[PDB]
Design a protein around this ligand. Sequence first.
Ligand code: MNP
Ligand code: NI
Ligand code: NI
Length: 257
Amino acid sequence: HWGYGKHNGPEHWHKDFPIAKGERQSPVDIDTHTAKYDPSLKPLSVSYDQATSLRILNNGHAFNVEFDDSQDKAVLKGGPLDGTYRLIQFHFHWGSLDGQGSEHTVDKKKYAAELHLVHWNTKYGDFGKAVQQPDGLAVLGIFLKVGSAKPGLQKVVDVLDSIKTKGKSADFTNFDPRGLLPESLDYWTYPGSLTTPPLLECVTWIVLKEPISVSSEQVLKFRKLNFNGEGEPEELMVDNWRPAQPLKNRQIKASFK
Ligand SMILES: O=C(O)Cc1cccc([N+](=O)[O-])c1
Ligand code: NI
Ligand code: NI
């Protein structure tokens, strides 16, 4: 019974999942001065025109916006990737305060939140099989800073009161994830892992350099969510970020100079 507390948080996970101390764990600090610009990198193709959102779920550690991944409707290709990656869900990680919440850091800077768009490699046929492979997933990571409102986020924010507690879901159709992307697709990339148990080392991370801006009011609404189930004592869903892990023998590549 893992979580983010003193007694069951990141620092304990290794007892259940020894891979926590592995060679390609995420997140990491992105040292912008040491990331090397890579000309091998093919351009990033995000093709979200046909995306079909289905549902939003409070899974007890975050909320997930789920997509129909039964066809190539919302796909990521190019960049560091070989082949086609289908969108399955997005989620966020966030803090109790505006000064923390992101998982990746940039020259040690923590953002207020981080958006993760999770995609699986179609050559493996389904998500469950893909997470067993070193190239199974591609996660597009976007930092959130507090400032102006993000209009394309509001639809997510307003349904959160209907999924307050663990296990609640709501229909969430017709949501366009393009409205959560910054202007530029410049990125850093490196090989890593999921950042919750089971911590599988199956992710090619693609972290965008340009943050999106959300309002204070928008982030506040994330912090009203609950880790607990209905009828259990209230524990606010905040600080659901794993801290930076050792880079070990990895290189972070930049798509830009
Ligand atoms: O890395 C995370 O935010 C945790 C996580 C946990 C389980 C599945 C996930 N996913 O990528 O569908 C992500
Ligand atoms: Ni458990
Ligand atoms: Ni994540």
